[PDB]
């Protein structure tokens, strides 16, 4: 190619969007934004294919141009705005607030939240560095640059960002016994407690996570997101509480509830 691509075939689109393979030939390409392409849910798919509010792309554009959709407390109008992990989607007319969280199956789940819990978000500190004029700043997983951080905040910590002011309200250190959420890999969507961090200089760090059912799994450190202390999450978790269930047990539960 001679430049950046602007099209996305349906088959090449991220699996977890759950797009029909025969509805069309192309899929929404998320525009550049806070989140990466493969780890983002564009607003069109959220409003049309998940909430079923809009029947087709044109109605989604009609919704957005009315300025009813807010992402992280700011109005967005791009149909392909890449909403992602820990972003708050507010629809005032419906009096609805959503937080985008992966369910156990690894897909973004429609999770309804109260307004108070919608007042803030959580961000993984991706970088801590001194800016120009000797001003420290922190860059989070969603690309927010926050100046004058608390000095104790280090990389891989979690910061609770208030959306109204864009400032850090509190922070959680990455330590053993903390509650964490998996945001990548085959263990995507699971929740557990840290047990031990293996360090490999010049390589990818590994973290052992024990679930509430005492099952253990190892995951690369880049895919871990600290969300609180054990039993005291700082956000409301989706149904299932991040517990992975075997196929047989899922069958049993499904038959029972039916």
């Amino acid at each position: 190619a001679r430049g950046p691509k602007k099209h996305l075939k349906r088959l090449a689109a991220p699996h977890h969007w759950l797009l029909d393979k025969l509805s069309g030939c192309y899929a929404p390409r998320p525009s550049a934004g806070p989140h990466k392409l493969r780890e983002s849910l564009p607003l069109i798919v959220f409003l049309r294919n998940r909430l079923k509010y809009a029947l087709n792309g044109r109605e989604v554009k009609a919704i957005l141009m009315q300025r009813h959709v807010k992402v992280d407390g700011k109005v967005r109008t791009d149909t392909t705005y890449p909403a992602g992990f820990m972003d708050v989607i507010t629809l005032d007319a419906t009096n609805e607030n959503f937080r985008l969280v992966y369910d156990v199956k690894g897909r973004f789940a429609v999770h309804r939240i109260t307004d108070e819990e919608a007042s803030y978000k959580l961000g993984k500190v991706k970088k801590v560095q001194l800016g120009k004029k000797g001003v420290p700043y922190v860059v989070t997983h969603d690309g927010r640059t926050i100046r004058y951080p608390d000095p104790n905040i280090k990389v891989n910590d979690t910061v609770k960002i208030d959306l109204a002011s864009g400032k850090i309200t509190d922070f959680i250190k990455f330590d053993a016994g903390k509650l964490v959420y998996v945001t990548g890999g085959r263990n995507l969507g699971r929740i557990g407690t840290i047990v031990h961090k293996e360090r490999h200089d010049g390589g990818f760090d590994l973290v052992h996570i024990k679930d509430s059912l005492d099952n253990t799994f190892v995951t690369r450190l880049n895919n871990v997101f600290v969300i609180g202390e054990q039993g005291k999450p700082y956000i409301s978790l989706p149904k299932g509480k991040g517990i992975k269930l075997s196929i047989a047990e899922e069958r049993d539960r499904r038959r029972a509830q039916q």
Binding site: V135, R147, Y148, D150, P151
Partner: protein
């Protein structure tokens, strides 16, 4: 060859066909920007001075300044040059153009009357063509009317009458770079925004300094305890 003579002070312009070759020969060997005497061309042009501006040959190709030849040549023309209008950004095209030396094979020669002779040409000197459009920018209006700074350009805008059937009205330009309260409001708003941002940054810096000082004092106290 035909002579397209233009009088810029009137803004007038007219074509004269030529048959006798004495005048045509005195045009020969000249160059764009050079001046020739009209009396040599003919009695009707006695006392006139003609500056050569360009021409077209029997094949229609134009004459280009800067190329000193009597024959056509294929030149690579680019943005902001005569004889070529680029269709696409950065497009450069090689086109045939006629040289800047007058020759026998010019179909038409363009002339500008630098100085008027004793006799008045019927179609050029005796007639006038008005300017199509008047000044638009405020300073241009002041310059045209020689207004003082205090005098408002608003009252000196040229108006043109348009009549449609039985109805009639006037049209006038939108002045640009006019001092209006909206512009003052915008300027003031920018200045206030700038000052407020500066003050907020200073406040944040002071708060961070206090936090760092408190942490430092606590750490030093702990170190003293360890000792």
């Amino acid at each position: 060859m035909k002579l397209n003579i233009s009088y810029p002070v009137n803004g007038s312009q007219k074509t004269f066909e030529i048959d006798d070759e004495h005048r045509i020969r005195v045009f020969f060997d000249k160059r764009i920007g050079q001046e020739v005497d009209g009396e040599a061309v003919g009695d009707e042009f006695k006392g006139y001075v003609f500056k050569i501006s360009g021409g077209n040959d029997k094949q229609g190709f134009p004459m280009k300044q800067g190329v000193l030849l009597p024959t056509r040549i294929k030149l690579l023309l680019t943005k902001n040059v005569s004889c070529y209008r680029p269709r696409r950004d950065g497009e450069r095209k090689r086109k045939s153009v006629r040289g800047a030396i007058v020759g026998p094979d010019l179909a038409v020669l363009a002339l500008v009357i630098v100085k008027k002779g004793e006799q008045e040409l019927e179609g050029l000197t005796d007639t006038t063509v008005p300017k199509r459009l008047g000044p638009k920018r405020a300073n241009n209006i002041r310059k045209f009317f020689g207004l003082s700074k205090e005098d408002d350009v608003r009252d000196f805008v040229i108006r043109r009458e348009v009549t449609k059937g039985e109805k009639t009205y006037t049209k006038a330009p939108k002045i640009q770079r006019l001092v209006t309260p909206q512009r003052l409001q915008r300027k003031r708003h920018q200045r206030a925004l700038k000052v407020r941002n500066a003050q907020a940054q200073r406040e944040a810096a002071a708060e961070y300094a206090q936090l760092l000082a408190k942490r430092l004092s606590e750490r030093k106290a702990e170190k003293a305890e360890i000792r």
